[PDB]
């Protein structure tokens, strides 16, 4: 880890502010950083593009991000970006032109000092076993 005490990786995203687009009832934005992989954020009425921004309260080194979904199968099209205090922005997982299945979680290597995490579901790919699901994110973790 980059943190003293040594340990391994720390979830510095956990409990941090989450802002973005409308949530449906019982599925608010905070569910993205609550440390529980079963609780979800779901966009109000499946409205897309849907976004979520985790504020890490200033620059922290982050090794890699963890984008967790409800389960495997969903065919969402999603962008994941990062931002520092300086105003620099970098797409770390560009998957907006996705066709076919998404897996349950994604490791997204960063290895940069960042202050913000921009997760954006831009649309839904045709087909799949779950063609009916709404724009949802279970958890985003920031490992440093
Ligand atoms: C039956 C189905 O497609 N379930 C999905 C889907 O649920 C929708 C919504 O989130 C619920 O609040 C509502 O009661 O049912 C909707 C179906 O029209 O999407 C979510 C993820 O976005 C999944 O949890 C369900 O499995
Ligand atoms: Ca959660």
Residue numbers in the entry: 1200 to 1343
Which sentences did the original study use to describe this structure?
CpGH89 (EC 3.2.1.50, CPF_0859), also referred to as AgnC, is a family 89 α-N-acetyl-d-glucosaminidase that has been shown to specifically release terminal α-linked GlcNAc from the disaccharide GlcNAc-α-1,4-Gal and demonstrated to liberate GlcNAc from crude class III porcine gastric mucin. Overall, the enzyme comprises a glycoside hydrolase family 89 (GH89) catalytic module, four FIVAR (found in various molecular architectures) modules, an unknown module, a C-terminal fibronectin type III-like (FN3-like) module, and six putative carbohydrate-binding modules (CBMs). CBMs are presently classified into over 60 amino acid sequenced based families; the CBMs from CpGH89 all belong to CBM family 32, which is one of the most diverse CBM families. Thus, CpGH89 possesses a complex multimodular architecture where the composite modules function together to efficiently act on components of mucin.
Though there are no aromatic residues present on the adjacent wall of the binding site, it is at roughly right angles to the plane of the W1333 side chain and thus well positioned to pack against the A-face of the GlcNAc residue. Markedly few hydrogen bonds are made between the sugar and binding site suggesting that binding and specificity for this disaccharide is driven primarily by hydrophobic and van der Waals forces and accommodation of the unique carbohydrate conformation. O1 of the galactose is completely exposed and oriented out into the bulk solvent illustrating how the CBM might tolerate extensions on the reducing end of the GlcNAc-α-1,4-Gal motif, which is consistent with binding to the glycan microarrays and to the recognition of the motif as it would naturally be displayed at the termini of glycans on mucin. The O3 and O4 groups on the terminal GlcNAc, though solvent exposed, lie very close to the protein surface. It is unclear whether modification to these could be tolerated by the CBM, thereby allowing it to recognize internal GlcNAc-α-1,4-Gal motifs, but the proximity to the protein surface and steric clashes that would likely ensue suggests that this is unlikely. The C6 hydroxyl group is buried in the base of the binding site and thus extension with additional sugar residues would not be tolerated. The presence of two CBMs with the same specificities indicate the potential for a multivalent interaction, thereby increasing the overall apparent affinity of the enzyme for regions that display clusters of the GlcNAc-α-1,4-Gal motif.
